[PDB]
Chain length 171, copies 6
C-alpha cells in the first residue's frame, strides 16, 4: 500500500531504542528550491524532539547535527533566522559576525542542554566538524535527487524519499 | 464503516503524543449560529484536556489558543460567559472593560498553570497575536462551511467536518 | 453475539479515561419495584469506584451524583439506609431531620474525600442543585421504560437497557 | 477446546482488578472427604495471594473469608492445623480453647496485616459472622455437588466445577 | 512441531508469576553419567535466576532447594566445588568438615540474601529437611529414567524430559 | 522470507533478558580480511550497549569480553586505536608498552563502570584469562569460515553468519 512505503523506511536504518545512547548524530537533509520554508522546520523539530535528549535528569546529553545542501544562502539564512526566533537555540560554529569556523562551539553545544541542535552550513564545515568530533559519529542522509559525498569510514544511511514531506514521519 | 471517516481524521491530522512539547497551538472552530452553545463547550473542554499540560510537576506549561468565526458577538459572549462560570479560567487580551487588545495577556497565560486556555475574539486579534508569540505556532482548523484564511508561514491543517459534534472525537 | 450490545454501550457513551477531570457527574438510574434492592447497590459501588477519585494524592477530588426515580419512598430510604451501614458515606442535602434542601452540603461532599457520592431524592432536589454546582455538569441516564426531562443546556446521554443488571458492566 | 470451560469461569464470574477495594470477601468451598488436604491448601494459598492486600503501602487492608462444608471435623481440623504450621496465620472466632464464637476477631483479622485470611467453621458461624461486618460482603461459592443456602440480600456467585482441582485456576 | 513439546511443559507445570511468594521450593534433578557437569550448572544458574529473589529492596527473600540423585559422590562434589568457585554461594547442612547434617543451616540460607541456593546431598538429607521447614514447600521433579519417591502430603509435580539440557528452558 | 534466518539466529541462541546477571561474557568474532574496519565497530558498539550494564544505580557491573582473529595485527591495532579515540575505553591486559599479559586488568575492568568492554588479542591471552575469572563464563562465537576451539567445560554457542554485517542485529 501507499502507507507501507513510510512503514519500511522507519526501522530499516532509522530504528530507535527507548533510550538512544549519546552519539554524534549527523542529519543531512537535501534542501531544493521547490521545497518551501515551512515544512523544513517541521522536519527539524521532529529531528530535535526524537534524537536529542536534554532533560535535567541525565548526565549525558546529546543533540543532532543538521546539514543542508542544494540551496542558496538566501533561504538557508532565512530558515536559520526563524529557528532561532522560535527559541530553538542552535550553534553553527560562527558565534559572532565575521568569525572563522569554530568547531569547539559544536563540541560544547552537543553536550549543552540549552542548545537544542547543531547547524552545519556547507561541505567544508561538515568535514572539519567530523575531525573535531572524537566520539562515534553516525550520519543519516535524507535526499530526493542529489546525494552528498560522505567519507567512507563513517556509518552512513542513504534514504531516497519522494520529496521533503516524507522525511518527517521516518524521523 | 461510519467510524472509518473518524479515524482518517483522528490519527492522520491531529495525532497526539503523550509528551508533546509546549507549542503555541491554535484551534480555529467554526461557530455558525446553528450549533448550540453546549456542544461547543464539550469540544472546548476536550480541546483543553488533551492539548494543555498544566500539572505542577512540569516546568514548561502550555495552553491551546481558541478562535471562533462566523457567529455573532451575542452568542460568542454567551459562550464566553458560561466558560468562566464553570471555573474554566481563560484570557482574551482584554483584562478590563474598554481595553485595547493586550497581546501580552495571552503570553504569560500561555505559561500560566491557572489560566486554562486562550480565547481569540476575531481575525484581527488572531493576526496581531501571531506577531506576538515568538515560539513555533501550529494552527488547527475545524470547519463546516467556511474555512478561515491563514498566512502561509505557519503549519496548518484543514479538516472538513460534517458538523460541530464530530470535532471532539477528532481531538 | 450477546456481548456485542455491551460493547455498543460501554465505550461509545460511558467511555472512561484514566485521568478524568473533576466534573459534576450526575448518574440518573431508573429504580423500579421489580428491581431488587441488592442489585442496585452493585451498580452504586461500581459507579462510586470508577467515577470518583478520593485518594489523598490528588488535590482535585470528585464524587458522582446519584438520582433514583420510579420507586416508592419507603424502599428508596431502605436502600439509603443500607448504603450508610456499609460505610459508603453520602449526602443528600438533608444533614438533619426535618431539614430543607441544602445544596451546599452537596457542594462540599463533591470535594470531600470522606464523602463517597451524593444522593438526590427526587426531581425538585435535582433542579435545585442544578443551579448550585458552578463547574461543568454531565448527566448520564440509565433507564428501561421512563425517560426524564433534563434541561437541554447540559451534556446528557440516554441509554436503554433491558433491566438494571446490565448497567454496572456499562460503567 | 478443553481450556474454554476454564475461560468462561475466569473472566465472567471471578474477574479481578489490580486495585480491588477492601470488601468483606467470602469464599465457600465444598469439602467432600475424597479430596486430599494438599489440593485444598493449594486453593487457599491461591485465594489468599489474590484476594488479600496486606502490604505496608496500603492503608485499607483486607483479607478473604474461608468457609468449608460437607465434611467431618476430623479432616477439617487436620487441614486447619497445617495452615497454621505453614505460617498462614488465620482466625476463626475461637481465640482460645473452649471459647464461644467471637466474630470481633474476624473483623480485626479482616483489617490486620499479620492475619492472612479468616476461617469459618460452619453455617452457624457464617450467619453470625454475616451480621457482624457492616461493610459490603460478597460470597463466592465453588462446589461440585452440594450448594449451600446464602441469604438473598448478598451479591453471590455460584460456580460448579468438575472437582476441587479446577477451583485454584479460577481464583 | 518440536517446540510445541517445550510449550506443553513450560506454561502448564512451571508457570511463573513475577511476584511469586517465598515458598520453600524444591528442585529435584536426575544427574546421570551421560550428563556433563557444565550442562547442570546452566540448569542450576537458571533455577537460581528465576526462583530466588535476593534483592536488597524486599523483606521476604527466598532461595530454591537443589537435590541430585543417580550420580556418584565423586562428580557430585566436583559439581559442588565448581559452583562455589563461580561465586554461587550455597549451603548444604554441613558447615564444617566431619559435620552431621544440620537442617538449620538450610533455614537461614533460605532467608539469606548472600546464600543463593541450598544443596541437598542425598535422600536422607531431603526427608530430614522436610520436617524442618515449617512454611509451605513445593517440590519440582525433572528426570529422564528414574523418578524419586516423594512424600504424598508435599505438593509435587513430576516432569519427564528427553535429556537434562531440556530442563533449563522449562524452569 | 529473508528475515526468517535472522529470527532463527536472534532469540534462539542470543536471547536477552532485561535483568541479565553479571556473567563473564566472551564474544569471539571473525575479523577476516574482507571485512571493513568500520562495520566491525557497529557490532562492537551493539555488543557493548546490550551486554554491559555500567549504570551507577546497580552494584554488580559487567562488561563483555571481545576476541578477534582471522587477520594480522595491522588492522587489529588499527581497529583497536579507533575504539579508544571514540571514548569507548577498554582494557586488554597490556596497561603499558612492552608489558606481559596481566589478566588482573581484565578482572577489574569487568567490574569497572568507566571501562566499557575488554579486548583479547589472541587465543594465548584468551586461555590465560580463562583461568583468571572465577565466576561463570559464557562464550559466544560468531564466524563465517573458521571456528576456533574453545575448551568444552564452558557454555558455548556457535553461529554461522553469511558475513559480519548480520552479527549486529543478532546481538
Amino acid at each position: 500500500g501507499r502507507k507501507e512505503y513510510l512503514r519500511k523506511l522507519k526501522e530499516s536504518f532509522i530504528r530507535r531504542s527507548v533510550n538512544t545512547s549519546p552519539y554524534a548524530r549527523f542529519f543531512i537533509l537535501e534542501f531544493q528550491d521547490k521545497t518551501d520554508i515551512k515544512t523544513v522546520k517541521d522536519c527539524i523539530y521532529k529531528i530535535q524532539s526524537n534524537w536529542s535528549n536534554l532533560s535535567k535528569r541525565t548526565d549525558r546529553p546529546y543533540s543532532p547535527f543538521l546539514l543542508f545542501h542544494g540551496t542558496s544562502d538566501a533561504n538557508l539564512y532565512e530558515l536559520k533566522n526563524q529557528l532561532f526566533n522560535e527559541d530553538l537555540i542552535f550553534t553553527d560554529g560562527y558565534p559572532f559576525k565575521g568569525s572563522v569556523f569554530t568547531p569547539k562551539m559544536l563540541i560544547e553545544g552537543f553536550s549543552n542542554k540549552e542548545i537544542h541542535f547543531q547547524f552545519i552550513n556547507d561541505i567544508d564545515d561538515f568535514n572539519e566538524t567530523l575531525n573535531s568530533i572524537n566520539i562515534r559519529k553516525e550520519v543519516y542522509q535524507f535526499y530526493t535527487e542529489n546525494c552528498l559525498d560522505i567519507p567512507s569510514q563513517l556509518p552512513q544511511v542513504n534514504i531516497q524519499v519522494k520529496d521533503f514531506a516524507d522525511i518527517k514521519e521516518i524521523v
